[PDB]
Symmetry: D2
Subunit: 33 residues, 4 copies
């Protein structure tokens, strides 16, 4: 159903935002070496 698809995209969005945060954190750690 379309609602299942919309929820999955929201779940994907939450995780992608977490991934961005983690990549930004890794970028910061590399810069403080």
């Amino acid at each position: 159903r379309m609602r299942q698809i919309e929820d999955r995209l929201e779940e994907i969005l939450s995780k992608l935002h977490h991934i961005c945060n983690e990549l930004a954190r890794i970028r910061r750690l590399l810069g403080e070496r």
Copy 2:
């Protein structure tokens, strides 16, 4: 080369955030259907 890897991660971050924004837009359009 570490500063270059840092720049590449920033370019990836940039594109990932744009992708989040496009997926958010898709999620929104689907909701209007």
Copy 3:
């Protein structure tokens, strides 16, 4: 700590590939509509 950053990037890669797979699945479901 570099080996740990490498492990984290692998964990991110893992999740990003899973996300690609879920988005591919969504693309497919939308096509069947």
Copy 4:
């Protein structure tokens, strides 16, 4: 339209696959330092 959405997801998929390739490449470069 749904076709516009499906095309955009395909375009997003192509880019995400490129991002995965680039993150894997960065992981490899860090491991050869």
